[PDB]
């Protein structure tokens, strides 16, 4: 799904750790990467064809 | 025999028929409540019977 | 003395005194007289969510005009414990303590109805199970909304699918003002735990 | 057939909602339903976990990271590790919260409105609901290092009053009174962790005090003018000092990080009312730094 | 002989008519009778039928004709049969009502008062009393034909949102999106009825949805501006399309009729309050087209 | 079997599980209250069952 | 076993010790009421125990 690389460094944002507090919404917690679910795993790897023409689903995203 | 933390729950109930209560099977009406013309309606039971309260005493 | 990080966690307990479950039970026979085990039982105690809920005469008011303001605050237990969880289930109870400077020359009554969640007042009927009290003789309006839901559990701030479970609607012939105190019913529970948010302290408004 | 009353005149009191604040009883609220026995079934196949997720055991047994320290190769021995985060290598042993930030915004050009914001663990968030607490506190001290960072680390427990510097708006610790000269750890309960292969250590500090319960006030409203309820909430502090200076080659980093997890076991609480001056209010972070927050009153 | 009170002060609340809206309890209404046990006997020899005529099973199991279609010899294959009645060969699977007429009368010369009139089956009439429903819907599709009309007919089920054309005052279906090109029935549950000798087919569509119950709002107040509660009331639609074109000689009629009966089995309902905006009001047909109807308010 | 000078104290109680009530052990929820889909909730017990009160009689 | 024309008199009583109630004999306190840390105070009895009412059910 994804392939992260972190070079340290770093002036960028993925190396910035968890702040102890959040005082306002413009100082949110920075994260390396997010993944919405299950809509990422259903699109990727040709799983979209093998659950087309169905309606309902249960799953546990491993 | 019913799980409830209130001591005796409500309105002590009688018995009925043997079927499923919905899902069409033509439920008979005479079987639902069990009070025909007999010693089971309490006002005909008081004069069959003949308790003292039907005479005003 | 090889090279490489390792594991094998060393649980150490200071102060070899006495098993703690004996000391706790011996400390609540002398300081409490009660033993609060579960946080679910704090959802059955009525805590007041407001102190002055001012309304106007002849106006059908949903409780989601009040609850939507006080869910964010976290004052009572159903709004403070809800920040640890993501789902809920079950009905809710309400009490409406009267604090109105009433007149004798009118007859005040308090109706209560059902709306589904987040509808307004004009897009629902009044033909349902109701309850009426008279605040001149019974100043506390006690009502319980059941769990009439399309789903087996309800999230927080869902999609445009609205009106999927029931709630309360308030009505009164006079402009009243009340103290609302809610709690869950005998089936109410949260679930699916997350971590807590932050807390808020004082506000001094310092001189510089 | 219509006989007379033989029953006595019963005494009466007109109390609507007698004891509404108790968790157990028989509640007089009318259901807006069809059935007076309106009752959902059990929680089978409702939530994705069949564990009682509301027990005080289960909620307070959720660990959370209170400290991420930084132990340099320059830091002295027998001196508490104070780099990066506030409170340093001084962890107050206790269920309440001890660290707070202060947000300062402007009302006018000559006035500032301060606001105390508190980072809560899922055990510190539950103790704020109650007045007094009593629990066995657990800690897991974990060192983020390579296979080539070696050192030794001391974690000793010291009961009672914490050595603190009360500021005008907050309370910080005092690292000047916790050096090896003035504060020897020769009599405390201590653990000397080796860092050549081993990383973690779990410490279970029981409840030791001269009180049956400790307050749950904590850092709420604590400053120079008011700091009594802070000291009477913890009964102890763990202190992390190096025994041996951090030995590291030049081909690795000159830092390690000490991550401290916190949870609690054997938790009992007392009174279902917060001991704080104001209500329990969840801090909703404002959109912009210039904007304000919600201020809950206390007048009825 | 006249001893003192040993009984406690009992707590009290002055609630007249506690829980009058529940079906079960003990009712405080004084009989205007002679006997406090005033009680009629059973229903033996009262009504001409000894069947419980008020069970939800018995009431909803009364079939009613929702569609009388017209399948010509000119209609194309793989295209839903839309001749005569509204909604065509698209039957929304569901207990509520989906079809409504609109009566338009004049208040002034510049204003028209509209009124929605709904044809109700004896299962659609019961679901309007309640808020949510859940039932196994049954259908009987019957072809009115001779022994010389032969054809084949397809009845497939498609779950979810119905392809509709929202008008400014009503909702109609969309036959443009249900042709054989755009909507293939190769994956649906389908029945391919032969019409050489056989006439009827009974289809029992169970309850399939991602919801435990569906709304009973239906076509009430549904238009372009408001159509959400329409889609969340049915979960599916049967669609009647020809596989083979209607084969008929010249000595018979060029039409057949498809009569669709509707009832329900395994019916459960939820909440004894209608989900509609207004009250449940029976449409009393006025004497003349120019006259008006009763308008029930909602103010108390 | 509980020492109390009030005659029957309050709210007659049901039974549960075998563990300590706090001190983490993953308390199961299905064991706490004992009301599955059976003759133990009183509204499903009234129609399994089929008492006269579900028919209005 | 007490002569009184009121049906059950008041506040159903527990038991105590064996002595005279005044006239100095150093009355022990632990013997007077019989509620130690055991299944005899009703709130520790509800979690020893583990009835359904301590879980909110």
DSSP letter string, C131-189: EEE-TTT--EEEEEE---BSSSSB-SS--S----BEEEEEEESS--EEEEEEEE-TT-E
D289 touches chain C (CB under 8 A): no
Q: Which two tokens stand for residue A41?
A: 């795993």
Q: What are φ and ψ of residue D177, in 5° steps? A: -100, 10
D169 touches chain C (CB under 8 A): yes
Euclidean distance between CA atoms E86 and A8, whole angstroms? 69
DSSP E strands in D93-212: the ranges are: 100-106, 112-118, 132-144, 150-158, 164-166, 171-173, 189-194, 200-205
DSSP E strands in E124-206: the ranges are: 132-144, 150-158, 164-166, 171-173, 189-194, 200-205
In terms of CA atoms, which chain G residue is nearest residue D8? G6
Cβ–Cβ of B36/E51 closer than 8 Å? no
Cβ–Cβ of B14/F40 closer than 8 Å? no
The residues near D121 (Cβ < 8 Å, ≥ 6 apart) are: C196, D62, D63, D64, D66, D97, D262, D263
Euclidean distance between CA atoms B32 and F56, whole angstroms? 9
Contacts of D99 in chain A (CB under 8 A): 20
The residues near C56 (Cβ < 8 Å, ≥ 6 apart) are: C175
Domain ranges of chain D: 1-300
Cβ–Cβ of D26/B4 closer than 8 Å? no
Question: Could you say which DSSP state residue B13 is in?
Answer: -
Helix (H, G, I), strand (E, B) or coil at G1: coil
* Exposure of C84 in the CB half-sphere (CA atoms within 13 A): 25
Closest by CA to E178, choosing from E80, E87, E85, E258, is E80
Euclidean distance between CA atoms E135 and E131, whole angstroms? 14
Euclidean distance between CA atoms D15 and D17, whole angstroms? 6
Contacts of B2 in chain F (CB under 8 A): 39-42, 45
Resolution in Å equals 3.2
Euclidean distance between CA atoms G44 and C34, whole angstroms? 8
Euclidean distance between CA atoms D115 and C205, whole angstroms? 8
Closest by CA to F55, choosing from E23, D251, D266, is E23
Scan for tokens 């917060």, then name that residue: D274
In which region does residue F44 sit, left (phi positive, over 0), alpha (psi from -120 to 50) or beta (all else)?
A: alpha
D261 touches chain C (CB under 8 A): no
Closest by CA to F17, choosing from D27, C38, G41, is C38
Number of other residues whose CB lies within 10 A of the CB of residue D18 = 12
Please answer whether residues E119 and E131 qualify as being in contact, where contact means their C-beta atoms are separated by less than 8 angstroms: no
Contacts of G56 in chain D (CB under 8 A): 23
Closest by CA to D148, choosing from D244, D243, D257, D248, is D248
**Distance from the Cα of residue E241 to its chain's centroid:** 23
Q: Which two tokens stand for residue A12?
A: 């960028």
Helix (H, G, I), strand (E, B) or coil at E78: coil
How far is E55 from chain B, CA to nearest CA, in Å? 7
Query: What are the angstrom distances between the C-alpha of E131 and each of C124, C164, D61, E116, E234?
Result: 11, 10, 42, 20, 13
3-state SS track over D168-187: CCCEEECHHHCCCCCCCCCC
Closest by CA to G11, choosing from C34, F11, F8, is F8
Cβ–Cβ of D24/G53 closer than 8 Å? yes
Cβ–Cβ of C29/G37 closer than 8 Å? yes
Greatest CA separation found in chain E? 108
Cβ–Cβ of E24/F55 closer than 8 Å? no
Closest by CA to C62, choosing from C150, C122, C109, is C122
Query: In sequence order, what are the beta bridge partners of D256?
Result: D71
Euclidean distance between CA atoms A2 and A48, whole angstroms? 18
Tell me which H or E stretch contains D100. Answer: strand D100-106
Closest by CA to E94, choosing from E272, E264, E253, is E264
């Amino acid at each position: 799904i994804d392939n992260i690389e972190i070079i340290a460094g770093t002036t960028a944002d993925a190396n910035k750790p968890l702040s102890r507090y959040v005082l306002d919404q413009q100082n949110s917690q920075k994260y390396v990467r997010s993944w919405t679910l299950p809509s990422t795993v259903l699109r990727a790897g040709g799983k979209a064809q093998k659950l087309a023409n169905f309606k309902y689903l249960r799953c546990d995203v491993q | 025999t019913s799980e409830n933390p209130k001591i005796g729950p409500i309105s002590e109930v009688a018995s009925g028929v043997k079927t499923t209560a919905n899902g069409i099977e033509r439920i008979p009406v005479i079987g639902e409540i069990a009070k025909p013309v007999t010693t089971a309606v309490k006002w005909f039971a008081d004069v069959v019977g003949t308790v003292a309260a039907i005479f005003g005493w | 003395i090889n090279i490489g990080n390792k594991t094998n966690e060393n649980v150490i307990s200071f102060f070899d005194s006495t098993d703690a479950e004996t000391q706790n039970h011996n400390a609540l026979m002398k300081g409490c007289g009660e033993f609060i085990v579960n946080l679910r039982t704090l959802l059955r105690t009525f805590r007041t969510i407001t102190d002055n809920w001012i309304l106007q005469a002849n106006t059908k008011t949903p409780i989601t005009d009040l609850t939507n303001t006080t869910d964010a605050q976290g004052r009572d237990y159903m709004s403070y414990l809800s920040y640890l969880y993501r789902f809920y289930r079950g009905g809710r109870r309400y009490k409406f303590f009267n604090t109105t400077p009433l007149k004798q020359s009118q007859t005040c009554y308090i109706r209560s109805f059902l709306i589904p969640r987040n509808y307004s007042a004009d897009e629902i009927n009044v033909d349902g199970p109701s309850h009426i009290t008279y605040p001149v003789i019974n100043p506390v309006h006690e009502v319980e909304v059941p769990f009439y839901s399309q789903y087996r559990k309800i999230p927080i701030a869902s999609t445009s699918d609205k009106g999927y479970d029931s709630s309360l609607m308030y009505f009164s012939n006079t402009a009243t003002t009340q103290i609302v105190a809610r709690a869950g019913n005998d089936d109410f529970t949260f679930g699916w735990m997350i971590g807590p948010p932050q807390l808020q302290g004082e506000s001094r408004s310092v001189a510089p | 057939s219509k006989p007379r009353n033989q029953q006595q005149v019963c005494p009466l009191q007109n109390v609507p909602a007698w004891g509404y604040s108790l968790y157990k009883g028989i509640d007089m609220s009318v259901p807006l339903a069809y059935d007076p026995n309106n009752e959902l079934g059990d929680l089978k196949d409702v939530f994705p976990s069949a564990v009682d997720e509301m027990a005080i055991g289960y909620v307070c047994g959720n660990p959370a990271v209170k400290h991420v320290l930084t132990w340099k190769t320059t830091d002295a021995i027998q001196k508490p590790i104070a780099n990066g985060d506030d409170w340093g290598g001084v962890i107050p042993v206790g269920m309440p919260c001890y660290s707070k930030s202060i947000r300062t915004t402007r009302i006018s050009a000559t006035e500032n409105r301060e606001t105390e914001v508190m980072d809560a663990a899922p055990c510190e968030y539950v103790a704020n609901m109650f007045s007094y607490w009593r629990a066995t506190m657990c800690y897991r001290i974990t060192v983020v290092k390579t296979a080539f960072h070696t050192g030794r680390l001391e974690i000793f427990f010291e009961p009672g009053v914490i050595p603190v510097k009360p500021t005008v708006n907050n309370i910080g610790p005092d690292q000047d009174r916790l050096t090896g000269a003035v504060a020897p750890s020769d009599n405390n309960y201590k653990y000397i962790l080796d860092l050549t292969n081993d990383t973690e250590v779990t410490i279970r500090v029981p409840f030791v005090s001269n009180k049956m319960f400790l307050k749950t006030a904590g850092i709420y409203g604590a400053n120079s003018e008011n700091n009594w309820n802070f000291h009477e909430s913890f009964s102890g502090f763990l202190c992390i000092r190096p025994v041996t200076k951090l030995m590291a080659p030049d081909t690795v980093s000159d830092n390690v990080s000490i991550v401290v997890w916190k949870w609690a076991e054997d938790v009992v609480v007392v009174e279902p009312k917060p001991l704080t001056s104001g209500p329990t209010q969840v801090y909703r972070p404002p959109p912009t730094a210039s904007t304000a927050v919600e201020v809950l009153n206390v007048e009825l």
